[PDB]
Amino acid sequence: YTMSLGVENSVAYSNNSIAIPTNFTISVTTEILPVSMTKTSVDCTMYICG
């Protein structure tokens, strides 16, 4: 299929209407960030030659 970018939304804009939130949601979201790799070393001489 041709993917949808998102659900269509029409904001009811006018020059004298404002939307004020009467409530709130305390949301917690996760963010995963890699920090380090495995510290590896290679013995070049013994890798190439044994």
């Binding site: 970018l5 998102g6 659900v7 269509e8 939304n9 029409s10 904001v11 009811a12 804009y13 006018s14 020059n15 004298n16 209407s17 404002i18 939307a19 004020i20 939130p21 949601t25």
Partner: protein
């Protein structure tokens, strides 16, 4: 298509696998880059039919319904001014999809300010949004409301000069 060359190439191990893997990683990373830049909102916003934004004029940055690609004049100017086993993979997002994402971002920031970036899009008149932004830099609201037509004229002139400067400087 040389069979003897390929027979010799099998003696070199998985170099080809490494190169294809690295290029595939780059290829998926490009799409990831485009997603992270543009696909920041999951609601596709549209501008209202009536372009009454308190004198502010966004025609140069809003999409042109006359064009088949639905690009803005500035976007169309940008696209006009930028011109053996190898395959070019098309990007995941087409130019039309990136234009729709940019259009959604523009519609959200015009009709709702910064509210659509932190949750549900909250409609607000544009001179009042710009008065909030004036508050955000330490300038009181009355400085904006008493000079609203002048600020709108300066904004429109600056947008037009941006279009001209892009068009005239290679």
């Amino acid at each position: 298509d040389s069979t003897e060359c390929s027979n010799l190439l099998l003696q070199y191990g998985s170099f080809c696998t490494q190169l294809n893997r690295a290029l595939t990683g780059i290829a998926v990373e490009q799409d990831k880059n485009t997603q992270e830049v543009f696909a920041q909102v999951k609601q596709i916003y549209k501008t209202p039919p009536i372009k009454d934004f308190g004198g502010f004029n966004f025609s140069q940055i809003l999409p042109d319904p006359s064009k088949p690609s639905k690009r803005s004049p500035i976007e169309d100017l940008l696209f006009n001014k930028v011109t053996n086993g190898l395959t070019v993979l098309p990007p995941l997002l087409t130019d039309e999809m990136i234009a729709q994402y940019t259009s959604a971002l523009l519609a959200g920031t015009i009709t709702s300010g910064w509210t659509f970036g932190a949750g549900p899009a909250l409609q607000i008149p544009f001179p009042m949004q710009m008065a909030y932004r004036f508050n955000g830099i330490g300038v009181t609201q009355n400085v904006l409301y008493e000079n609203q037509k002048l600020i709108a004229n300066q904004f429109n002139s600056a947008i037009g000069k941006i279009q001209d400067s892009l068009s005239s400087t290679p």
